[PDB]
Design a protein around this ligand. Structure first.
Ligand code: CYC
Ligand code: CYC
Ligand code: CYC
Ligand code: CYC
Ligand code: CYC
Ligand code: CYC
Ligand code: CYC
Ligand code: CYC
Ligand code: CYC
Lengths: 172, 162, 162, 172, 162, 172
């Protein structure tokens, strides 16, 4: 896996070059925005349970066939597995925000998830929808102006969104 | 590879846990450190030719046998001098990568893993690289946190070479 | 899932053995039990509306805050009451499957695995279900071996909710 | 694995239904015939070594090329493997009788077997003949009127036959 | 299968090592032995009919019940005598393979693996094979290193059958 | 795996036959030439490090892009792995000479190597060139008349070459 820094390092080593000023300056800005990145991680983490619980409930509300007997989320074992995958994806999204690179999420979580789901008959379109709900909740929690020094978190919010989008597309 | 950010996530991942205050503190220490890391990388980069050819010259002067003894492993031909300056160039560039990463990761991955094997097979004396590194340390002219971090990687490599 | 018949075969299979008198004794014990187990499953099924409605009403009475407190986890709306009666029906239906099977296997597979996690995530109180199960135990009208086998499944769930 | 009872349970749960009265009555009739099932398992078990050895002996008499040098059953290791296979299939057939469901035999014995035989060049048609001979020996043993309470075992004998025929087809 | 050459390489391979003087000495050992091994294989092949028939007959004299008792496992019929002669031939041939290989490997692979299972399932008395091997030992007429190596294989089988 | 002796044994057993006099005599000739086999193994082994190092050096001198940044032998980890592969291939080649049969080399070394390389992006054609360089070096060492009792090693040298050729062809 890479973090934002080792990612750029790998690109430069492959060409046998020192980082360029553009590369160094880009990492400088990331550094300068670091408190926001940390607040983004903390805020999602602090609300993890309710992000999962509430998106799950809304998912089952809109898709009652998932919880009907014979549904994919019917029985407590399958409901537990389903709640667990929700939390796993949210967890790995927070890792990507923390390192500033998608690789932890792609390499350790999303890669081969579609195939996993196909074999079990987990409906990936419903997973994707659950993820999208978590995304919307997570974004509103991070953007919330209360109890925090005020400023512009649009870059970190956009990066965050992008990781949720990867998660939903990896199973959709 | 090893940096504060990848290590924190690997720890949390291996416990199946969300990041917590512990890893947030890691991120804080990373971001406290990074500007001087980037500046150290930038300075070494800008001063690469002087440092590499200076270090080369300090090795040849410390070990005159290296420029006057025939051999594939020696710097007695233009080819061998070029191999040696190349190598010193690699050490320096990969040090800059460690400063960029804020960890030994780039060193471990691109230089340190296999180093002993390489030095042995090609009959390259660890003491030659130790000397080149001592020169870089004595001559990069860095101050403060830049110095401290850059010297930690340099000494990391000297330690690895002895 | 766990029934006398699957357990006996799995034991034999893991030892690489043909079935022997030990497992035939398990079968005899199974077939001695099954007549009353099947009869109990038939009675509970025919009585399900009465049991499920009575169990829900027992719970609402024992815990009146469940019908008056607003909340996704509560039975203060028609939808909430419907969720609750639904869940109680699940417990009853799956108890009948254990009688059918002659073991906890259907309970373990369909209801008990992930149970704590569900009750935690959705903020459902174990004690609600204990009360529902108590009502079922008191009102199923079974006797003899039917009663004893049924009561063991109901008690097995009460134990798992405590 | 399912037994006869849990097989019916699985179906009912997926529909979120109690077993119907007729479904329960069918299981009641299997229960009332339980002694015959037990005698069937015990009888085959009691004669397992000779059921295997006699089937094998006849197979090799009819198919001399199996045991000629270079043949699939030639060398003590290959002969031992072949006998073992016959015993394993008989064993799993008895488990299926004991449980009143094919799943133990399908999941633990028959699944993958065709493919394994194709990889090794075991002649599947020959294994299938071997299984059919064991079926015939076992049926005659189970149907014997000597030294048992008299009654009608045609249903359990037919069920027993069906597991052998399933096994034979899985490799033929 | 087990021979000096395969055993030496498996050792070296397991250690991740080049062969060294140790394994060369193994090969020196193999090549000192092999001429007498190959001579023994030739001699036993040339004399196979006599040794087999003679061995069969020695079993029939020591254990006359084997030719007078009806049963699938006995040699009271022409078919039975023929299975018996065939088996003894298998023993003899596979011994010649051990002499060719300079090791028990062929015995191990083609005869010994599964031997107890076959003797047991088909009700063949190990003492029958013992007697036949004793006869071959007493009558092959071999001398020196040929006799010693061949007897090692025959005794190896006698030990395996007892 | 087989040695030269068990290879002939395997062919005979499948046909239910004693080795012919012709087959026994062919093995006799192999045995009579054993000292040259032993010298071949010892000669390569005594020179293993320089055979690998010189071949590697020559490979990189003719294909500099292998060691340039971004090249498959760039970084010390990749270099050490490449050097190890060369050493492994040479090692297994000597085991084939020792046993007098290709199977040790094919079964334990070359089988699946093409696939391994393709999955890693190791350039198999460049490995093959490395192998051909070791072949020529090794052949010249084994061939060298100095310091050994004089005689004709043409057969064993040709057999040696055949093992190197198998290696080169397996990696491409
Ligand atoms: C977008 C995410 C929202 C936002 C963020 C934001 N944060 C800061 C500044 C800081 N936040 C912290 C964080 C912590 N201190 C701790 O001890 C811990 C626990 C381990 C945390 C999570 C810190 C130290 C700072 C600096 C001090 C300060 O409050 O300024 C800013 C200010 C700019 C900056 O990057 O520093 C901003 C904008 N603010 C919003 O309005 C968004 C909704
Ligand atoms: C078809 C398979 C043959 C057949 C079977 C048959 N069996 C019974 C009855 C019983 N069999 C047993 C068996 C055992 N008792 C033990 O203790 C053991 C050892 C562990 C065994 C294996 C028992 C207990 C009974 C019941 C009492 C009795 O003796 O009858 C029947 C009778 C009907 C019934 O199901 O009970 C039958 C028909 N009968 C045949 O003729 C078939 C060839
Ligand atoms: C082709 C490979 C070259 C060649 C080989 C060659 N060798 C011999 C004979 C011997 N070689 C040995 C070797 C060893 N003795 C030891 O103790 C050790 C260390 C463990 C080794 C490696 C031995 C014992 C002999 C026999 C005695 C002797 O020196 O002759 C020959 C001679 C014929 C034969 O096969 O014996 C040959 C030809 N010689 C060449 O000219 C090739 C370039
Ligand atoms: C009745 C005793 C009390 C009550 C009930 C209540 N339950 C839920 C939600 C769920 N119930 C379950 C339980 C099961 N589902 C299964 O698959 C099985 C085994 C087959 C069981 C026992 C689950 C998983 C849920 C959540 C998912 C779903 O809605 O199906 C609710 C609604 C919860 C929500 O937050 O939406 C309620 C109200 N609540 C009371 O106050 C009663 C006393
Ligand atoms: C809930 C939104 C949906 C749903 C989910 C569901 N998933 C499974 C099973 C698995 N999910 C995973 C995924 C992961 N496990 C990991 O360790 C990682 C990476 C770290 C991921 C991303 C796996 C591996 C499985 C299979 C094995 C297991 O159960 O753990 C189930 C269970 C399916 C079953 O029948 O067994 C379910 C139900 N189901 C829905 O209906 C929702 C749309
Ligand atoms: C200079 C201090 C002395 C010197 C140098 C010298 N080096 C080589 C050859 C190699 N050096 C390396 C080193 C690296 N390759 C990597 O990928 C990395 C990390 C990115 C490093 C540090 C390697 C692998 C080689 C061998 C292969 C190659 O040619 O690239 C030589 C040539 C040796 C030869 O046998 O060809 C020389 C001369 N020699 C001196 O005398 C100087 C004092
Ligand atoms: C005898 C009637 C026939 C025959 C059989 C034969 N089979 C094999 C090898 C295998 N058979 C199995 C089967 C199973 N293993 C299990 O554990 C299970 C489920 C519990 C089954 C059903 C397997 C796995 C193998 C391969 C592994 C092994 O050898 O143990 C052989 C050996 C083939 C070889 O070349 O080694 C043989 C000979 N062969 C005949 O000719 C008869 C028709
Ligand atoms: C002769 C000493 C006595 C004797 C022999 C006898 N053997 C069999 C049957 C078998 N013998 C073998 C043995 C082998 N098969 C192999 O692959 C190998 C290694 C290459 C050996 C040693 C086997 C496997 C069988 C059974 C299968 C077959 O028929 O080939 C019989 C027939 C027994 C039967 O039940 O059909 C007999 C008669 N019996 C005596 O009384 C002699 C003293
Ligand atoms: C050098 C001439 C070329 C080269 C080689 C190279 N190989 C690898 C990695 C592997 N090589 C093997 C091969 C084997 N492993 C074994 O144990 C055996 C049999 C005993 C063999 C033959 C394997 C398995 C690997 C992968 C695992 C490992 O690293 O050990 C690499 C590393 C590639 C990477 O990116 O990790 C390299 C570089 N590369 C060149 O450019 C030369 C043409």
């Amino acid at each position: 896996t890479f973090d934002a820094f080792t990612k750029v390092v790998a690109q430069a080593d492959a060409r046998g070059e020192f980082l360029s000023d553009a590369q160094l300056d880009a990492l400088s800005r990331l550094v300068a925005e670091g408190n926001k990145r940390i607040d983004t991680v903390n805020r999602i983490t602090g609300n993890a349970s309710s992000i999962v619980a509430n998106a799950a409930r809304a998912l089952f509300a809109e898709q009652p066939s998932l919880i009907a007997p014979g549904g994919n989320a019917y029985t407590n074992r399958r409901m537990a597995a389903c709640l667990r995958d929700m939390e796993i994806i949210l967890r790995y999204v927070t890792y990507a925000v923390f390192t500033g690179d998608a690789s932890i999420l792609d390499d350790r979580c999303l890669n081969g998830l579609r195939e996993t789901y196909l074999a079990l008959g987990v409906p990936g379109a419903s997973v994707a929808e659950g993820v999208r709900k978590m995304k919307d909740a997570a974004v509103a929690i991070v953007s919330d102006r209360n109890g925090i020094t005020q400023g512009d978190c649009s870059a970190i919010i956009s990066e965050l969104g992008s990781y949720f989008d990867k998660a939903a597309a990896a199973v959709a | 590879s090893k940096t504060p950010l990848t290590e924190a996530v690997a720890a949390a991942d291996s416990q199946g846990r969300f990041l917590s205050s512990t890893e947030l503190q890691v991120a804080f220490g990373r971001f406290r450190q990074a500007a001087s890391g980037l500046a150290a990388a930038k300075a070494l980069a800008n001063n690469a030719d002087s440092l590499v050819n200076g270090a080369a010259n300090a090795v040849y002067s410390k070990f005159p046998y290296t420029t006057s003894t025939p051999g594939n492993n020696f710097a007695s031909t233009p080819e061998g001098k070029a191999k040696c300056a190349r190598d010193i160039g690699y050490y320096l560039r990969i040090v800059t990568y460690a400063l960029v990463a804020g960890g030994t990761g780039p060193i471990d991955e691109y230089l340190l893993a296999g180093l002993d094997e390489i030095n042995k097979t090609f009959d390259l004396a660890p003491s030659w690289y130790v000397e080149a590194l001592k020169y870089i340390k004595a001559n990069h002219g860095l101050s403060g946190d830049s110095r401290d971090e850059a010297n930690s990687y340099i000494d990391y490599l000297i330690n690895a070479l002895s």
